[PDB]
């Protein structure tokens, strides 16, 4: 039976352009939310987001290649290179066939979709860029990274809205465990802070409109919450079969032990009050890992800061953890980072892993006045020191009622 | 060890709005390509495509729900309902948790992306539809079908350009075999025949521009070929664990025995001359199925009608089949249907299955003057009667160099 471990990490987020800088900022409760300045937000109900500050790909992507990629792909590539470098893995003719990728995005290249469509409206199809398709489609991060590293193994890209990051990581692990690969770079990337992204999610009445205090906007489980805050970035993990990792002397961050999936079968853009779908996904991951709920020390929640979404997950956690419900720590790092959509489950899996390494759990900031009758410990305001934590669980749910949960185990 | 079989089929294509009507047309060598009339093609270099004729969802999708979905989702839903009905499966509180979906698309809702962006350009973000996001994103076919049927099991959506259909079907099978589900509705849907789709792929110099003879445009392996022909539609299969199918008396079309994946690691929009990536995917599927190349009776090719793409796959088939290379039949149904992109591998898996049932293989029409020095039997012009065919193989390759192959076995 093939075990899967994590041997490399890469990340760009609204609170940092590296894995360690991001983690340090989160443990310090720092918000990465600010006013948007790259497009005129005068007519927009929401005028802020979690932006990647000073993104730099100068020594990573050539000038000729950059022009063929939407920002989401550039972010995904940079984070993937960080992960591959961190892993110390060396690609050879002999193992190239055994290394692949599972990397997705929820919405893909909105920026270049807008640019190409604007061009078409203004001057006809002759003005569409030859790069339109490959610069926008969701699977292009995987495409570029395999070419860059000479990876010939399986490559897939799961696009399940906010569940993407978790599904790609989960299936990369399945692929390795099944025997189709020994290593996979997996994760997600997103850059939806554009007119269509902000305007689109705004049209759905899904975003916080707290323009007067952007850093206090994302407040999961707080009574004054009014929708999610969009965040940009990318998270990538190098997953690897255990004996393969040991043989080459890899550094091992944690083990990936459980992966659960479910569907709400309720409504396209809202969960059932019950949180039955969320619960089933967590139950499935626990069964996959062969452990009980009481063994989980921390749950990095989906917790987007929407009125109904946050309540359903709290109900789901209560259902699954029962008597232990008050003893597990639960936090939503989206309180600081915003919602990275297709990259959310990827960066949040990284947070779940580092929590095991450092035995420290990041807080749900802004939780000033929690919804009434719920006795869960949402790690409000300040990071928490933990002691003999062996397992963490990461939840990611998505439009369409698609759910996913991953469980990581220390060492 | 859990075996996976096919118990239901659903399909909309340019040659028919049902599984049997489509198959009858293909065995008869009928083209489904015609001039586009739903948008003004005056300024477009390519003015034809494979369109779904007289699509009807009146008794399937309510008027209230139709307005929330791009055409690709409406096609995917109709084909999924056809498959679920064909399967005879009855969803209960007891099995709901064991039934899921793996359905994707390569490009998603171009039609409604254009409509929403046009609205934004003309009147600001206030004019974007509240349905923008859920009406366009790739995972919405899976989302709607799970809600419609009350499916609570795993739902994923793989978006790997033209490889989508094969990857979704392959991973649905993996999910069942692993134990995460007993049944999965899997496949793909696409409706990229819009200004951005035709103009976008046209900008890349990837489409045939034979406007004076649209039905002769798609001509895989023919010397006068000049790019692919875009096709719309959707293909869905109900996959099911073997003992589960038998117990309820399901009708069984074929068994899914092998699934292989690879990456070219060559170029974003073209394969290597070698076809090494295509070859590895077929090799992987053969190994997964535990059989030799000589046992395959028919290969339904990726064969899009591009100069370099068709040559690389012919080289790959020669590499894998060697001495048997001239004895296996190879055909590209895209010669009649056009390229359904994210749905191509789904409808083509259906063709691969029916070929086993009927012991008949559809032709590569338009193959008037085959490229020189290649001795493969591409089933030119006319369908072929076969005799003791036990295995078929379906190839699907995609931008980003991502490849996939599936192998189906009779009974
Ligand atoms: C149907 C409704 C009712 C409505 C009312 C209260 C709410 O909380 C929101 C604002 C968001 C629900 C949600 O959490 N969806 C939801 C979900 O199910 C799965 C994933 C996500 C995600 O962000 O990743 C998500 O956001 C909904 C959205 C739309 C309009 C609002 O009035
Ligand atoms: C890089 C080039 C060179 C060029 C020259 C000859 C060709 O054949 C085409 C027209 C298409 C190659 C191809 O088959 N890609 C290709 C591929 O790798 C994987 C999938 C598909 C698919 O359609 O699903 C596909 O189409 C390419 C496209 C672009 C411009 C042309 O001059």
Please return the burial class of B318, using the count of CB atoms within 10 Å of its CB with bins 0-12, 13-18 and 19+: middle
Distance from C-alpha of B9 to C-alpha of B186, rounded to nearest angstrom: 10
Which is nearest to A14 in space by CA: A3, A30, A37, A38? A30
Whether residue B217 is found in the same domain as residue B267? no
Q: In a mutagenesis test of the A interface, which of B203, B271, B398 is the best target, namely the one with the most A β-carbons within 10 Å?
A: B203
Q: Please say whether the beta carbons of A351 and A337 come within 8 A.
A: no
Tell me if residue A410 falls in helix, strand or coil.
Answer: coil
- What tokens does B264 get? 């070219």
Q: Supply the range of the domain harboring residue A155.
A: 5-258
Distance from C-alpha of B254 to C-alpha of A368, rounded to nearest angstrom: 59
Domain end: B238, B258, B278, which one?
Answer: B258
Q: Indicate the length of chain B as a whole number.
A: 411
Atom of ligand 2 nearest to the CA of B268: 18
Q: In a mutagenesis test of the B interface, which of A36, A102, A137 is the best target, namely the one with the most B β-carbons within 10 Å?
A: A137
Cα four-point dihedral sign B28, B31, B37, B39: positive
Distance from C-alpha of B379 to C-alpha of B329, rounded to nearest angstrom: 6
Q: Please say whether the beta carbons of A348 and A396 come within 8 A.
A: yes
Whether residue A141 is found in the same domain as residue A79? yes
Cα four-point dihedral sign B221, B223, B228, B231: negative
Distance from C-alpha of A280 to C-alpha of A316, rounded to nearest angstrom: 8
Tell me if residue A176 falls in helix, strand or coil.
Answer: helix
Whether residue B246 is found in the same domain as residue B119? yes
Phi, psi (degrees; rounded to nearest 5) at A371 = -50, 145
Give, using CA atoms, the residue closest to atom 16 of ligand 2.
B270
Which is nearest to A134 in space by CA: B161, B135, B147, B13? B161
Q: Please say whether the beta carbons of A118 and B121 come within 8 A.
A: yes
Cα of A388 from ligand 1 centre, angstroms = 36
Distance from C-alpha of A314 to C-alpha of A301, rounded to nearest angstrom: 9
DSSP summary character for residue A187: E
Whether residue B84 is found in the same domain as residue B191? yes
Considering only CA atoms, give the Rg of chain A.
Answer: 20
Angle between helices B71-87 and B140-149 (to 10 degrees): 40
- Helix, strand counts (H, E) of chain B: 14, 14
CB contact under 8 Å between A401 and B143, yes or no, is yes
Domain end: A258, A281, A314, which one?
Answer: A258
Whether residue A294 is found in the same domain as residue A221? no
- What tokens does B16 get? 């028919």
Which is nearest to B157 in space by CA: A133, B260, B145? B145
B201 touches chain A (CB under 8 A): yes
Q: Please say whether the beta carbons of A404 and A393 come within 8 A.
A: no
Cα of A206 from ligand 1 centre, angstroms = 6
CB contact under 8 Å between B268 and A134, yes or no, is yes
Whether residue B254 is found in the same domain as residue B123? yes
Atom of ligand 1 nearest to the CA of A304: 23
Whether residue B272 is found in the same domain as residue B229? no
- Alpha-carbon distances of A169 from B99, B237, B261, rounded to whole Å: 22, 25, 17
Give, using CA atoms, the residue closest to atom 18 of ligand 1.
A270
Structure determination technique employed:
X-ray
Residue with tokens 């949960």: A405
Distance from C-alpha of B400 to C-alpha of A46, rounded to nearest angstrom: 35
- Alpha-carbon distances of A44 from A35, A213, A411, B74, rounded to whole Å: 12, 16, 47, 30
B252 touches chain A (CB under 8 A): no
- Alpha-carbon distances of A387 from A27, A310, A362, A390, B349, rounded to whole Å: 16, 27, 14, 9, 52
Kindly give, in sequence order, each residue whose CB lies less than 8 Å from that of residue B372, ignoring residues fewer than 6 positions away: none
Whether residue A21 is found in the same domain as residue A88? yes
Whether residue B122 is found in the same domain as residue B171? yes
Angle between helices A195-203 and A110-123 (to 10 degrees): 100
Distance from C-alpha of B391 to C-alpha of B377, rounded to nearest angstrom: 17
Residue with tokens 């915003």: A338
**CB B312 near ligand 2, within 6 Å:** no
CB contact under 8 Å between B263 and A146, yes or no, is yes
Which is nearest to A10 in space by CA: A67, A78, A74? A78
- Alpha-carbon distances of A380 from A141, A340, A352, rounded to whole Å: 35, 21, 17
Helices (H), B56-187: 63-66, 71-87, 110-123, 132-136, 140-149, 164-178
CB contact under 8 Å between B147 and A267, yes or no, is yes
Cα of A237 from ligand 1 centre, angstroms = 29
Distance from C-alpha of B102 to C-alpha of B394, rounded to nearest angstrom: 18
- Alpha-carbon distances of A231 from A18, A37, A54, B398, rounded to whole Å: 16, 14, 15, 29
Atom of ligand 2 nearest to the CA of B205: 30
**CB A396 near ligand 1, within 6 Å:** no
Tell me the nearest-neighbour CA distance from B209 into chain A, angstroms. 14
B183 touches chain A (CB under 8 A): no
Kind of pairing between the strands at B233-241 and B4-12: antiparallel
Tell me the nearest-neighbour CA distance from A179 into chain B, angstroms. 10
Q: Please say whether the beta carbons of B71 and B189 come within 8 A.
A: no
Distance from C-alpha of A396 to C-alpha of A190, rounded to nearest angstrom: 15
Distance from C-alpha of B102 to C-alpha of A114, rounded to nearest angstrom: 29
Tell me if residue A267 falls in helix, strand or coil.
Answer: coil
Cα of B142 from ligand 2 centre, angstroms = 29
How many structural domains comprise chain A?
2
Give, using CA atoms, the residue closest to atom 22 of ligand 1.
A398
Which is nearest to B312 in space by CA: B334, B343, B281? B281
Q: Please say whether the beta carbons of A387 and A361 come within 8 A.
A: no
Tell me the nearest-neighbour CA distance from A24 into chain B, angstroms. 33
DSSP summary character for residue A51: P
Whether residue A242 is found in the same domain as residue A266? no
Phi, psi (degrees; rounded to nearest 5) at B65 = -80, -35
Domain end: B258, B292, B315, which one?
Answer: B258
Chain CA centroid to CA A139, Å: 16
- Alpha-carbon distances of A212 from A37, A48, A208, A218, rounded to whole Å: 15, 10, 11, 13
Which is nearest to A116 in space by CA: B130, B117, B400? B117
Between CA A336 and CA A343, with CA A338 as vertex, the angle to 5 degrees is 120
Phi, psi (degrees; rounded to nearest 5) at A340 = -80, 10
Tell me the nearest-neighbour CA distance from A142 into chain B, angstroms. 7
Q: Indicate the length of chain A as a whole number.
A: 411
Which is nearest to A289 in space by CA: A194, A405, A203, A155? A405
Whether residue B254 is found in the same domain as residue B266? no
Whether residue A239 is found in the same domain as residue A325? no
Please return the burial class of B282, using the count of CB atoms within 10 Å of its CB with bins 0-12, 13-18 and 19+: buried
Neighbours of B295 (CB within 10 A): 17
Our mutation pick for probing the ligand 2 site, out of B228, B306, B342, counting the most ligand atoms within 8 A of Cβ, is B306
Q: Please say whether the beta carbons of B268 and A134 come within 8 A.
A: yes
Which is nearest to B381 in space by CA: B207, B221, B206, B235? B221
B145 touches chain A (CB under 8 A): no
Which is nearest to B31 in space by CA: B271, B350, B274, B333? B333
- Domain with residue A321: its CATH number is 3.40.47.10
């Amino acid at each position: 039976k093939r075990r899967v471990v994590v041997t490399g990490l890469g990340m760009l987020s609204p609170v940092g352009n590296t894995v360690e800088s991001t983690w340090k900022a989160l443990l310090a409760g720092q918000s990465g939310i600010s006013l948007i300045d790259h497009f005129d937000t005068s007519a927009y109900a929401t005028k802020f987001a979690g932006l990647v500050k000073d993104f730099n790909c100068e020594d990573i992507i050539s000038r000729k290649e950059q022009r063929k990629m939407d920002a989401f792909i550039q972010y995904g590539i940079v984070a993937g290179v960080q992960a591959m470098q961190d892993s110390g893995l060396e690609i050879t003719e002999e193992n190239a066939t055994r290394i692949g990728a599972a990397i997705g995005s929820g919405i893909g290249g909105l920026g270049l979709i807008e640019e190409n469509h604007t061009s078409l409206m203004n001057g006809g199809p002759r003005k569409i860029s030859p790069f339109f398709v490959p610069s926008t489609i969701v699977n292009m991060v995987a495409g570029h990274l395999t070419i860059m590293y000479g990876l010939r193994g399986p490559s897939i890209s799961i696009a399940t809205a906010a569940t993407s990051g978790v599904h790609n990581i989960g299936h990369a692990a399945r692929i390795i465990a099944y025997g189709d690969a020994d290593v996979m770079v997996a994760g997600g990337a997103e850059k939806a802070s554009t007119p269509l992204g902000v305007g689109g999610f705004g049209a759905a009445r899904a975003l916080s409109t707290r323009n007067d205090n952007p850093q206090a906007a994302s407040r999961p489980w707080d009574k004054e919450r009014d929708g999610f805050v969009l965040g940009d970035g990318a998270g990538m993990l190098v997953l690897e079969e255990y004996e393969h990792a040991k043989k080459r002397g890899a550094k091992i961050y944690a083990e990936l032990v459980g992966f659960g999936m479910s569907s709400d079968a309720y409504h396209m853009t809202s969960p059932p009050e019950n949180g039955a779908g969320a619960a089933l996904a967590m139950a499935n991951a626990l069964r996959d890992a062969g452990i009980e709920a009481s063994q989980i020390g921390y749950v990095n929640a989906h917790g987007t800061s929407t009125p109904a979404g946050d309540k359903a997950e709290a109900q789901a956690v209560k259902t699954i953890f029962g008597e232990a419900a008050s003893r597990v720590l639960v936090s939503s790092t989206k309180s600081m980072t915003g919602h990275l959509l297709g990259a959310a489950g990827a960066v949040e899996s990284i947070y779940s892993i580092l929590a095991l390494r450092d035995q420290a759990v990041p807080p749900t900031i802004n939780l000033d006045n929690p919804d009434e009758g719920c006795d869960l410990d949402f790690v409000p305001h300040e990071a928490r020191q933990v002691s003999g934590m062996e397992y963490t669980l990461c939840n990611s749910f998505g439009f369409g009622g698609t759910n996913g949960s991953l469980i990581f185990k220390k060492i």
